[PDB]
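Subject: Predicted fold for Zinc finger FYVE domain-containing protein 26, 187 residues

User T.R. writes:
Posting the sequence so we have a shared reference for the thread.
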Amino acid sequence: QQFMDQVRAAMTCIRFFSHKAKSYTELGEKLSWLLKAKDHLKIYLQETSRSSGRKKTTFFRKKMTAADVSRHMNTLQLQMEVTRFLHRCESAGTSQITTLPLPTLFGNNHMKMDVACKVMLGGKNVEDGFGIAFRVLQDFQLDAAMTYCRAARQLVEKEKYSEIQQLLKCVSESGMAAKSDGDTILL
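User M.O. replies:
I've generated the structure tokens; pasting them so everyone works from the same file.
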């Protein structure tokens, strides 16, 4: 497709990155697909901006929005928050409770929201991963309240008594779980 309708070339990296995933220690090798997708999406958005002349939507392509590129670059890049809040913890063995498919930002509403809980709970405390949790949640535009509650429940199953206060502060501090939400959510 470089010799070329490079639509397959554009779409290849997203599926190729997840080709036979088992862990994150060797991720840093073949995880270049994120940078490649960000670069390709940026080039596509620029070219669409560069497509201000009389160019046609010939069958080698068509005409649609290139905000698809302007958000696929985000799919490539913005995930780095939760990605780090999970990977830096898992490198030292402090992050083992990861969802078996680990639903990334390409998952469903709850599946994409599942990144926020791992982001918050990756570090040694809520004060470590809460920023990445918020970045994933706003990126996801989903309910970080349910994800934070699930993470806190699994941490209670992990017996994180000291982390309960930090979890409540994160639920009612960044602006997600209401001040009165400490009843049912903490429950």
